[model samples]
Target chain A: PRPPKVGSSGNASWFQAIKAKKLNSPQPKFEGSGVPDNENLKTSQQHGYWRRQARFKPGKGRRKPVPDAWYFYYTGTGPAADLNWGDSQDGIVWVAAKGADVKSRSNQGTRDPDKFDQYPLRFSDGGPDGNFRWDFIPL
Target chain B: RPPKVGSSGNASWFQAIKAKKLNSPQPKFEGSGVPDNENLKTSQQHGYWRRQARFKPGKGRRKPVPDAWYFYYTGTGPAADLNWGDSQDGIVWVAAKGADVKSRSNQGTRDPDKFDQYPLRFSDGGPDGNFRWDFIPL
Candidate 1:
């Protein structure tokens, strides 16, 4: 599609330009001997249990649903692979989505699906993709 | 003894299910003033249950951005008429959406720009006419 006309005060041509630039950017390729092997895989039950354990305090409730929890699924090669989260108020019907890359720790993995992790969609500060909302308070 | 903090092998202490006649009681209707003066003033601000959700930048040095915290608004008002707010580092931003969840807690009116807040009403799952929210970390 043709780029939006520039010079107009509300012109979105800049956004088009940026999108084109991104589409043309080279895809990242990472292959290294530092990558770990099969250390983080867990069974679905184990995954659920681990997620529950991480979220709720011990001896709480096994069948009692954990409020506001999520499940994680990983993809791609290396410990630096991106992660996906399945969000749920009851942990059963999760609204899942892929997250942006993790910069701090490779294979750091998820702690809980429902609990907010400081990564993508940090604050609804200002963005074009209006998916999630945010509220921030001073430290 | 205090209850355990992280146990995962038990059921909830209180669970119940009851049904009532759908078309049962209809109270006598009384009309108020022209604008309806039966209004009882109530606070709109209430304490919030908070969680921090973060997002990494697409590019730049591999460093984490500041995390954003979300406050679930659980207060009075119908799901279609909820009011909540938000903030960043305690400073409010200029973005909010209709609330999809309401807590039994919200009771005061606060500025929406200084600290972010909005109303939420869940539309699916569980018993009919119930609302819940699971704030995502994307």
Candidate 2:
């Protein structure tokens, strides 16, 4: 059965339940080849899932920006979330945080000067500086 | 004698005339209270005199900003006014070909995700699809 809709403030219990369900199942080979998984399993697919699940009544689909709380930066490279500064090397999957910060940290590195116009996701405790210390849950 | 002002409107011509007058032997100082040695020399005593003699007014002033090309990042930081993207650490600077974008953000006190917003994305020229760029000045 489909998971319950996300609440306005985000349903931590729902997220955990869905995450557990996906972990217990094997990778689906086809649409109907394996046990039913969260229909919104892909990163792109989860945007709608999170939007509806959280009941965030703004913007269309996943286009809505996130708050400045500590969120996970799914690297889309592996099943486990990569919580390192280097996670940015790979394209981000989706960002999740409890709340937003007043002002986010600047994105500055030690190598050649570069910039990010659009971020896949941002968190209160994450920045270009090497400071990634937080508990992140995989969706 | 004072020199005629040039039509070019440069200060060098006026400066040259002043330099000549100062360098010319001054009889007022010949036997006056002040000594008339190398210390009395205009170029030796005045920095402006020496500067004017070698002055090329065309090259004296700072270079002008290039035409229609945004040359500097005026954002906050130690290297705020730099022309290149070498010092933009935690800020974003954008300039379109011939237009300006509006500024938004509630002093960075609100969550931008709950609202409509536009953000820039940077990319590297690679097939592996790794996006590795940050808040650099443009």
Candidate 3:
């Protein structure tokens, strides 16, 4: 029922590489935007696109670290645009993930959702198309 | 008074139905500007219910992120999970409003049918201590 609590000060591969590029790109579908125009509630519920892709399958739910909070992301002000977060030339301290390998064996950089393509998986906050919510700042 | 401190952006107070069980067609109002503008003096860091969502990291500029971080959808619309986040919208907000919402909240009310949990809290939606973890009561 709970996860994302390891060494703390968590990061989680830049939000698990932006949730694996919004589950390999596939959006636009409304009505609480969990996509299910009723096909037996789209193969017997889990809704919200089946628990938001049930933690990006692949061993299911693996982005742990969150217990408290710190936050970081904004691959050069593009996903929409905002900056000055905690400073460092305005967000982008991804903790390290340009080429991967952190000191010992950390490994980050989001497994290349095309290098986060600047992270901007569309936004449909009103249901349909990977739902929505964003705008964060902290150092 | 009427549960109003700034809400009802009117996507139909959200009714994709899951608790009462199944319905459809809601999201469309698109106006208010979400919420959380309480202008704090004592949020207690509940981070709007609990702060366990975990979605932030690399790429954010239009201002606004983290509520469950469900990829932390902001502005352009993806902000459901409490109402929209539809097609799994990256994972149906609160398990498709299962139990009609309410992840953690108690001290006076919430049980007539529950509803508080969902990155909520802006004026009077209730449960918004600003989360960072610490409510754990009983």
Candidate 4:
């Protein structure tokens, strides 16, 4: 569950408070380091929770001038090293590429299929193939 | 003159084309009641002429999109009618609401100054009444 909005009695706005809370919270522990196992991944539930959490915050909707970074699940028939986002599934995710690479990677396994055994990852401004049609997350 | 690619090396496609076509044949009119201005509009000159010309190919430019229709100009003023295809200038001028009124010179070049004059104009797309840039000739 998302934490309640911190009071704005101080100089900090709700956004600042949310950021601080998210930063201080313990990192979500997935089953693996490179990419979690499909069995351990929670796609619909986690996505629903995160989507709700993102919208629950004040002033936390779509960002102006859509984000540059994006996340997608690879669904090709090649080595993960060369698996570009060309043969990816739906639900392309996006975010402003201004923080640690792993920050976006943290939300990878949240939107995958049950038997969708592929590496989920995030990429900076230009997509895995240098050009992927990524839809903005609007949060 | 146009600025070279910035230090960030992020020259837009439009800017790159503009720089490439710095010296090209400019579209001119050979008729009466034309705007007597050379530097009035040079956007199509310093770019891919055909690409810019096709930017808005009059009636063909727009599909039957669910939006109010706007009038495009060939020159800076009113003599060009994108629909009529007679005085079709290379550029687009004003885009406002309502039928072709007197201010539009009845969709002709009868009065070049009258055709060119417009109190309000939109940049690319309008009807919401925002993003109003200068009503420059092109």
Clash number for every model? 63, 17, 60, 5
Off by over 4 Å in 4: A1-56, A59-82, A93-139, B1-46, B49-138
Clashing pairs in 4: A62-A138, B74-B89, B77-B116, B78-B115, B79-B109
Worst 10 residues of 2 chain B by lDDT: B8-17
Better candidate by TM-score, 2 or 4: 4
TM-score of chain B of 1: 0.21
lDDT of each: 0.22, 0.20, 0.24, 0.22
Sliding window of 10 residues with minimal summed lDDT for model 4 chain A: A11-20
Candidate 2, residues B25-49, lDDT tens digits: the string is 2111111111112322222211111
* lDDT for position A53 in model 2: 20
Model 1 lDDT tens row, B1-138: 111112110111111111122231211112110111112222222323222222343363223333322332233211112344443232211111222323333232332323333323222222222212344222
The C-alpha stretches of model 1 lying farther than 4 A from their native spots are A1-128, A131-139, B1-44, B49-53, B58-62, B74-138
Alpha carbon lDDT at B2, candidate 4? 13
Report residue A20 deviation for candidate 2 (angstroms): 5.8
CAPRI quality of model 2 = incorrect
User: Per-prediction interface RMSD?
Assistant: 18.1, 33.9, 18.1, 22.4
What range of 10 consecutive residues in model 4 chain B has the weakest lDDT sum? B8-17
Return the candidate ranking by TM-score, descending: 1, 3, 4, 2
Scanning candidate 1 chain A in windows of ten residues, the lowest lDDT window is A11-20
